[PDB]
Design a binder for this molecule. Structure first.
Ligand SMILES: Nc1ncc(-c2cnc3ccccc3c2)cc1-c1n[nH]c(=S)o1
Length: 299
């Protein structure tokens, strides 16, 4: 590939596994190339993100160390997309694989991938309302209704991913971004598709605070790992502060689990039953995303 052209998922995945010019594969017709190119200020305009609860704007949102998300607008279709910049050295096929193959209303759609210089630009669905972490940080504890609303979206994302035998591996407030009508799941960098009933990891993956005990133990886990992470995300959404942090992490988590003490006194018995169910230590006794959607607290 020497130019930016429209292609299939198979073309995108082949490019991902594979001189000042730009090359790449566009999956959605929303991204407009002109003469096998996609240049800034000529084809796409990089607009700032709106920090709703801060009355200011931001050119980009920092995502770890080897990631920054910009807000791009296709000058032709006027379509707003998020633009994630991942350097070639730190670029993994997992960053495109799940989003290219599996499309769902509650998974941020990958529109295209463009390599320019030493960085890979991933154009995808822009959560213009921001991340669940941004709301919590700028406002504090969320209201029970907003919690129920967001969770019903995430659970519909996870039920789909787990039906495809996929473990996200990083469900946290930071990876739940939202729009006016819905919330989408982001960051598939640590994602993995299960080949068997149990997944055996080679290294510890995820964010310590939201990690399940079975993940920290490294003996074996499944899609149930995401359910615990959602429970940990829920206690952060409910209290406004992440679990463990207030009381006190790998040693503390492997011994004490779940952090049921971190659940606020204000919490409703319905939501508390949902949070406690999702945080169940035994993965076998922990509910599926499909099961939790049927819970009284959500419906
Ligand atoms: N598609 C996206 N849409 C939105 C965001 C985002 C995150 N935080 C914000 C905070 C404050 C304001 C806006 C925000 C927007 C991140 C992405 C994204 N995709 N892949 C990864 S990793 O990040």
């Amino acid at each position: 590939l020497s130019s930016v052209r429209y292609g299939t998922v198979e073309d995108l995945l082949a490019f991902a596994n594979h001189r000042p010019q730009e090359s790449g594969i566009l999956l959605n017709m929303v991204i407009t190339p002109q003469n096998g190119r996609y240049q800034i200020d000529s084809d796409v305009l990089l607009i700032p993100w709106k920090l709703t609860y801060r009355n200011i704007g931001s050119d980009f949102i920092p995502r770890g160390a080897f990631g920054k998300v910009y807000l791009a607008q296709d000058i032709k279709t006027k379509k707003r997309m998020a633009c994630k910049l991942i350097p070639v050295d730190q670029f993994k096929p997992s960053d495109v694989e799940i989003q290219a193959c599996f499309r769902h209303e509650n998974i941020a759609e990958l529109y295209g991938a463009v390599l320019w210089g030493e960085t890979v630009h991933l154009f995808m669905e822009a959560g213009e309302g921001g991340s669940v972490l941004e709301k919590l940080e700028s406002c504090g504890p969320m209201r029970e209704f907003e919690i129920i609303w967001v969770t019903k979206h995430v659970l519909k994302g996870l039920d789909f991913l787990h039906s495809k035998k996929v473990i996200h591996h990083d469900i946290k407030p930071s990876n739940i971004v939202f729009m006016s009508t819905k919330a989408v799941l982001v960051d598939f960098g640590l994602s993995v598709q299960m080949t068997e009933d149990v997944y055996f990891p080679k290294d510890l993956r995820g964010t310590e605070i939201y990690m399940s005990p079975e993940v920290i133990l490294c003996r074996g886990h499944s899609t149930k790992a995401d359910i615990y992470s959602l429970g940990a995300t829920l206690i952060h959404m409910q209290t406004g502060t992440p679990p463990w942090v207030k009381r006190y992490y790998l040693y503390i988590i492997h011994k004490q689990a779940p952090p049921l003490e971190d659940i606020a006194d204000d919490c409703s018995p319905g939501m508390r039953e949902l949070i406690e169910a999702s945080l169940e230590r035994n993965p076998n006794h922990r509910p599926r995303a499909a099961d939790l959607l049927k819970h009284e607290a959500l419906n």
